Amino acid sequence: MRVPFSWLKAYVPELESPEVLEERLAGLGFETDRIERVFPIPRGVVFARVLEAHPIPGTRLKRLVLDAGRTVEVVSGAENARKGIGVALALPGTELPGLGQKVGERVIQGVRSFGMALSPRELGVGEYGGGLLEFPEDALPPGTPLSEAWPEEVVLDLEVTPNRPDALGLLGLARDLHALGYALVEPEAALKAEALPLPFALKVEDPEGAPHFTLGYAFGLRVAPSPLWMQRALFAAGMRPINNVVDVTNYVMLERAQPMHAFDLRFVGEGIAVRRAREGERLKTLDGVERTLHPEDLVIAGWRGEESFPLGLAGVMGGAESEVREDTEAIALEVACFDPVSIRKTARRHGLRTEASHRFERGVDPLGQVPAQRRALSLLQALAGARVAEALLEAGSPKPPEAIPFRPEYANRLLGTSYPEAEQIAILKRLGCRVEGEGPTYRVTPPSHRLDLRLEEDLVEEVARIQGYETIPLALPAFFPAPDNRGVEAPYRKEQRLREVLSGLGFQEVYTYSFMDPEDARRFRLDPPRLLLLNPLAPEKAALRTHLFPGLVRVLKENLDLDRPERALLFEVGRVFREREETHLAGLLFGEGVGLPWAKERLSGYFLLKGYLEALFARLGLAFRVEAQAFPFLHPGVSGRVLVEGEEVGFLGALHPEIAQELELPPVHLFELRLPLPDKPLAFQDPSRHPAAFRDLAVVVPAPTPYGEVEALVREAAGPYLESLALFDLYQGPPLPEGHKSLAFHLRFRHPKRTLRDEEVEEAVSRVAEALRAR
């Protein structure tokens, strides 16, 4: 919301300056996003009045005869240009914002234009530029430099939160500054109304949408351009002056957050009817756009006999036809309170967001209608010399706010402050609240324009902001936390230790979007995503990742294309979405592998990834092993499920080549698990001092058989004294069955209490060999 210092200053006279103001506002809850200086008018531009406007034959131009002190001529192409108005005349020699070329005396078409009148765009006071600025023919003594009556201004780009709709009005803010101790100057609406009856009627057929509705009657209107100060304020507010009457409705809408529209009686007929639109109703709105209505759209219509026609779109924008022009002498004034949701719906239903729409959506003072009408009519009488009827057409009696219970002690208790009761009340009272009661708990009824004030707490936030958030002291709480909160951190903590170990083991962490391209459900042989977006960021991120690894691999690629890393080892922990949200952990390896850089060999591939994997669990104190498993996305033979401490979770393997190639990518190795990892609480165990029993042993079994079962059996039969069991070698082997292999198994044994008697060693050894291939 634009905030013109000088204009606001009209209600809060004692303002120190824009900066101090920016300060004061920040503290009340309004942040300034920008500050600007705005109306620099060189001495060259002066006030002039159009005595005559003669059109140049054969051209679409006019030769204006101006009174600028001495008489003078200029040539203008502007349509609004005509006799009887005051205009902004930039004399030859004047430097203007827009044109870097100085203003001069150019011969235009048989006529030498002395300077040129200006458009708002040209003077730099507005964006318009499609016609001349129009002023009351008598605003100033011809010739007087304009800057004399049009001083630069300072405008604050303020941010008004949705909870402060009353702040969409400068007078709303003034009220707040006043609360800080500033003097407030409410504009007095002087009015000489007359007894006579209103020549029209009002019928509200949809009271749900129009809870409160009022109509004013003004006639004998002299529609003319707005006075300078008004044009100045409106222009500063970022709004464009049209004529005194329309201008007034805007000024007041900006003053109090109360939008209002003036309808030419010519088009009203018998009366005004606030009703929903009939399917397919047509309406050429104000912006010159022709539109068709939806039946949910509330509208302001009129009627003649048995004719009902739309006049404007209720609380959003008026009809182009009914709008006020030069030839208007009497109108009806719309000042109401519409239902926010309908406006919201209707507003967004068509491509619109107007000053009106915006305010009504955020909420309008339920009882501001009437005082607003007095304000506007008073202005009309003054600026359009309107004759005003003393009566209004009203529809719907809304209820006042209720008292809110308030305990000053509680306030302090809540803030952690010590403000004296009186100070608090004084504040609330300065904010326009009524305070009844003797204490300690009071009866506080807020002013109707305040909608954000319902609870006692809302009331406290007030004393706070007015006293100042900085006046609240600093403190720290001390307490023994409820017992059920004890362990709480464990999960999080667990995840992090893990996260850390990895990085220390040698993995680079990576962060990937939780999105997924539905297409990849194919590209990578996997089921489809169970969750889809209704408003995806892009069709390639329209689903929710079910797997982590796809993203990893994808990252691999793009890294290769940007920089060419020889090898790569990383991981990522993230949430995947299937039937339930789940925390997954995946890691990817690729490259030559590790070893001597210069020296020939490397050691990499799958058994490298496993190497690391095993060490990790070695570090977590968890038993892990792998068993071949068929995986749609994993190259078979190089596929395998993962068994953490006796459990099946995740997989590990070489990325299926079909995919390896479907992407400009070489061979990659993967694994993806589900967290949290289960945990084995350690059971400490005394190690014995008596030396172990050592053994040399090999096994010959089919080339297909998995290491697993082998170790498994040997191990399960070794006996209760098997300390160690390792594999130091194996090869297919010429000296044995074509379809069998050899196995170097190193063995160790020990007995806690005593040394192991050989009787039991070469004995238990057979216990194994027996059922070894006895199977």
Binding site: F480, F607, R619, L622
Partner: protein
């Protein structure tokens, strides 16, 4: 390929149980705003005894079997990097740090001091000459004993409980009055564990601090402030916690032992 096969023999590291226990205890006090700081293993008889109300020829000095040192060219640093004097020895407990910290800082504060200490004693299944302690000190105006009580209580909860509790009995220490020994309730094993000693920092200790400070040019900071400090044996707790039976086990660099605590976290 046979995937069930073993991968590349990669080294899986681990941490020493004391380190783990230390860590655990530290993370605990850290949640109450205590900050960890260490001191020197080689101290001056001044910081180890004199600074704390410990006399030379009286029964108190006789509660700590100290290791005396000898040798030249050894430079001992004081709290401010200055060189200090006094017969050299091996810190008999971590309390000296109490002083060094106070001399070097300003209240209010909360610190905790882990550290290896030395006592001349015969090494058995539950007694060592080299072990670790964890000192705690919280100084500031207003500090009282209830604070210490809550402190310890929180610690209990943190370790066992909330079905556990604390026991505070009066005991004597030259650097605290009131002095006390505290035990903790172990719901699982069902017994009371004497954990360590604590108490309200003794006035003569504060006196000492300020006196040395001024001798160093600094203004007094401990007049009109209160404080409590405590210290507990780490090995004992570690043993009860991780279920170890022989205290000698810690300084016995056996791997089969050390590895047993690989995944403790």
């Amino acid at each position: 390929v046979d995937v069930s096969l073993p991968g590349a023999s990669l080294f899986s590291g681990g941490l020493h149980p004391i380190t783990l226990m230390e860590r655990e205890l530290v993370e605990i006090f850290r949640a109450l705003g205590y900050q960890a700081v260490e001191g020197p293993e080689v101290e001056s008889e001044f910081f180890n005894f004199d600074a704390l109300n410990i006399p030379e020829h009286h029964p108190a000095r006789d509660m700590w079997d100290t290791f005396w040192l000898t040798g030249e060219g050894f430079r001992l640093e004081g709290p401010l990097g200055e060189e200090v004097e006094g017969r050299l020895l091996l810190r008999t407990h971590t309390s000296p740090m109490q002083v060094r910290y106070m001399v070097a800082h300003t209240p209010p504060f909360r610190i905790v001091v882990p550290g290896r200490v030395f006592r001349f004693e015969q090494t058995d299944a539950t007694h060592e000459a080299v072990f670790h302690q964890l000192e705690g000190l919280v100084v500031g105006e207003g500090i009282a004993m209830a604070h210490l009580k809550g402190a310890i209580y929180e610690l209990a909860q943190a370790l066992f409980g909330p079905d556990s509790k604390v026991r505070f009995q009066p005991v004597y220490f030259p650097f605290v009055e009131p002095g006390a020994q505290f035990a903790v309730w172990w719901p699982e094993g069902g017994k009371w564990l004497e954990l360590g000693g604590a108490g309200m920092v003794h006035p003569k200790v504060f006196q000492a601090v300020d006196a040395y400070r001024e001798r160093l040019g600094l203004p007094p900071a401990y007049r009109g402030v209160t404080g409590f400090a405590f210290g507990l044996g780490v090995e004992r707790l570690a043993m009860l916690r991780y279920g170890i039976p022989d205290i000698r086990y810690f300084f016995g660099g056996r791997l089969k032992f050390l590895e047993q605590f690989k995944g403790v976290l």
